[PDB]
Fold Catechol O-methyltransferase.
Amino acid sequence: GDTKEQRILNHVLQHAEPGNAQSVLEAIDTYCEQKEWAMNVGDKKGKIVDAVIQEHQPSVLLELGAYCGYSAVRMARLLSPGARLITIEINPDCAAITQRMVDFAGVKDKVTLVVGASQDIIPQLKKKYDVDTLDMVFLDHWKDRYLPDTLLLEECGLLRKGTVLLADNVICPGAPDFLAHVRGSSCFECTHYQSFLEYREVVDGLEKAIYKGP
Ligand SMILES: C[S@@+](CC[C@H](N)C(=O)[O-])C[C@H]1O[C@@H](n2cnc3c(N)ncnc32)[C@H](O)[C@@H]1O
Ligand SMILES: O=[N+]([O-])c1cc(O)c(O)c([N+](=O)[O-])c1
Ligand SMILES: [K+]
Ligand SMILES: [Mg+2]
């Protein structure tokens, strides 16, 4: 047998142009639109993600929740040389697929995949992964981790003035306690981007929360 994630990877390996990141993204989106839905950020919201990367030019980017590597590829393809994306994924099998997806897309030099929980890995980023501070963080893992991982990042001293937090799904499935914290707090400048749930007409949005310092 096989899983949906293997089926998404199979489709890419069989239909996308090796080494072409845009091709990989289109192959994934077309499969998911036409065959089976999957929780990739997708093309519509992906464009908003692209604009934030192009606007902030992060050199150290952290991703929470990699899944099949769609957003990893989507973001890594826009990064300058020497820039690095660190992506954390709790599921080893998804991490295996993400790694292959990133290899096939031609952006493996930009990506550092870590297998483990965000809450476990975040306190190790300075000692084990040579991070000083993060330039940007994409939050797209289980929504109940959004707030406590944000607080962890802050407490571990990983945020600096101008650090960009970008969170998917803040409307659907939703991340209300995260939104309340960053929107109510004097330590964050927030912007909401309304859009649509990936592959659907259900309304969703992302939240951009710029850390203003402690
Ligand atoms: C929505 S998918 C990520 C999709 C990816 N960002 C994209 O757009 O292509 C959610 C992922 O986060 C992972 N996840 C959930 N909780 C996590 C945690 N605490 N630490 C790391 N990964 C987690 C899940 O296993 C799943 O692969
Ligand atoms: O259920 N969904 O439609 C989604 C969508 C998403 O974009 C998700 O990131 C998600 N999740 O991580 O739980 C779930
Ligand atoms: K605020
Ligand atoms: Mg999502």
Summary: The beta strands are 60-64, 84-89, 111-115, 136-139, 164-167, 188-196, 203-211. The longest strand covers residues 188-196. The longest helix spans residues 42-56.
